[PDB]
């Protein structure tokens with residue numbers, strides 16, 4: 001029954017997240033950040049809004065979706081670099 | 097028309113490996129593709145930002161209005177209009193190359209053949225992509241299609257220009273993929289900020305010999321050297 | 336459903352409810368919740384159809400409830416099927 | 432042949448700019464404001480076809496030996512010889528010099544560039560770290576915490592540089608001691624010297640009603656950073672938590688100023704103080720001057736590499752006042 005819409009989502013928040021994830025994903029052994037992962041953020045934000053039975057996706061749904069994807073990427077790493085990546089991406093997640 | 101899509105072997109295209117290693121398809125079947133595009137992530141930040149803004153405009157649903165605007169503007173056409181138009185071009189027109197276009201295509205063939213010869217000598221290995229006479233037929237075919245868009249009864253020289261541009265943008269990039277001493281001799285002899293005219297470097301190293309221009313290419317790829325002033329001045333710009 | 340959904344804590348109450356007898360593993364339960372609600376499938380002007388589904392991979396050590404999480408979802412989803420390893424075949428997976 | 436245009440010659444004539452280094456940040460270490468002079472003279476002295484825009488090596492050797500002659504006679508206090516050596520920097524550049532040569536000016540210039548980088552290499556090789564460098568000045572992070580501990584170590588450091596033959600003739604001069612330094616460029620910085628100074632070209636682009644406000648909050652930020660530095664040192668990157676000494680007052684103040692702007696930005700009684708100034712290099716238009724002040728203050732505080740997260744959260748909660756999203760291009 002429920003079909004959320006991305007009404008007035010924070011584009012630049014997501015775009016900077018994708019740009020930084022892509023830049024740090026240049027590491028040739030890491031999880032391959034790709035355009036379908038950007039779509040994943042948008043799908044996930046819709047899924048959280050679906051859990052709320054919500055016609056509209058909120059910033060909180062999108063922030064949680066970003067946090068899920070960023071955590072998924074950050075933990076896909078050799079431990080020699082995980083702390084630095086956590087520190088860098090914290091500017092996007094620790095606003096929530 | 098076979099329009100085929102494939103991933104490289106090893107998943108992402110591996111720049112340290114040859115295209116014949118990155119690709120499972122044999123040279124026989126590869127020759128049958130008039131154009132091969134090898135597509136890679138640049139990972140450039142401005143490109144990825146542009147893609148991200150575009151993708152979010154797709155998901156937010158503005159793209160429906162955007163395409164409708166572009167179609168009312170005539171900057172885009174609908175699927176059915178383009179389908180009818182493709183059928184109209186296919187049934188009404190079949191262009192021929194002008195004599196000037198025919199000579200230009202022949203000269204471009206010998207040009208890219210010379211380019212493949214120097215590349216195969218340089219790499220001392222034969223390419224996975226065969227740039228045989230069969231590939232000139234592909235460039236002819238592309239030229240004819242380009243003229244076929246506008247229903248022009250002749251394919252003019254401009255259509256050969258665009259056909260050559262597309263072949264250079266696709267199959268040539270699919271195909272076109274001791275110095276240790278000369279490079280550091282140049283690092284010693286040319287200090288930072290000053291310029292060496294290429295002709296003197298040619299005389300100086302050849303009199304000791306094509307390792308020269310690989311040393312130029314390597315020091316050009318790094319920031320250390322920068323070809324400058326129509327390529328006549330070798331400028332030690334970086335470290 | 337309407338009544339309980341407008342609780343501002345509903346997302347975490349759902350995620351805690353996911354596979355309730357499995358302790359911890361809150362990121363798995365989050366990913367499972369997201370997948371099981373899904374995004375929104377789309378098609379721009381009929382030209383460009385976009386996946387609504389969210390695909391999740393549980394990669395990890397033996398005895399960490401990954402199989403039991405799948406067996407939970409098998410009971411929980413409306414349409415679902417479960418296949419294991421060499422018990423599958425390519426045609427048995429897509430169509431035959 | 433000098434009548435003709437030439438691409439090397441025109442590059443030689445047109446080009447001059449140093450690759451000046453500017454490592455912006457907050458610095459709780461003491462920072463040495465090293466003045467420099469005699470870099471041209473020192474490099475001409477310490478200097479040392481296939482290369483076609485290098486000045487003639489023979490003529491350069493004559494210039495070096497002659498400058499050594501002049502320098503020795505200046506050491507013996509021939510006042511005319513000292514006046515000569517001081518004036519050499521003009522002659523190597525002055526096109527009215529009878530022996531002016533573009534290749535000479537350029538050869539001297541890029542040697543000066545290389546030597547400035549080698550001076551930076553030496554200072555960093557001695558364990559310090561460079562905030563800023565150009566042909567007249569170097570600012571250096573010391574890896575030390577108090578000026579009263581460092582008046583010996585700084586003079587050791589400077590002497591250890593000048594005793595290297597590459598820099599034998601430099602006028603290395605510790606022109607200031609900074610206890611605490613906030614730095615983004617040499618026209619936009621503040622710090623405590625050993626006493627607080629503040630200069631910001633950023634301030635000049637705020638509208639008049641907000642220029643006093645910017646300076647007041649800059650003093651508050653400096654005071655908070657100072658309190659936090661000495662607090663950390665009594666407990667024993669030291670800045671961690673400094674925002675907490677003023678953040679809530681700042682948000683209260685900014686809420687009040689936003690209300691006042693909504694009341695008065697339109698008003699002919701007050702609009703004059705909301706006019707954004709026209710200035711040299713006035714880069715861009717702006718529609719909300721309070722937002723310009725907040726952007727400036729957050730940017731200054733975001734220079735603090737150790738503490739980015741607390742400033743980032745404060746920046747979010749400030750930008751919430753305008754209903755501006757945290758990463759919106761307006762913000």
Ligand SMILES: Nc1ncnc2c1ncn2[C@@H]1O[C@H](COP(=O)(O)OP(=O)(O)NP(=O)(O)O)[C@@H](O)[C@H]1O
Pocket residue numbers: 356357358359360395396397398399400401402403404
């Ligand atoms: N957090 C947990 N809470 C409850 N039971 C758990 C938990 N972790 C593991 N188990 C138990 O571990 C047993 C095996 O779980 P299983 O689903 O096979 O884990 P697994 O990660 O899939 N192991 P594997 O099949 O080797 O990959 C089950 O009987 C679970 O009850």
Ligand SMILES: [Mg+2]
Pocket residue numbers: 400401402403
């Ligand atoms: Mg299992």
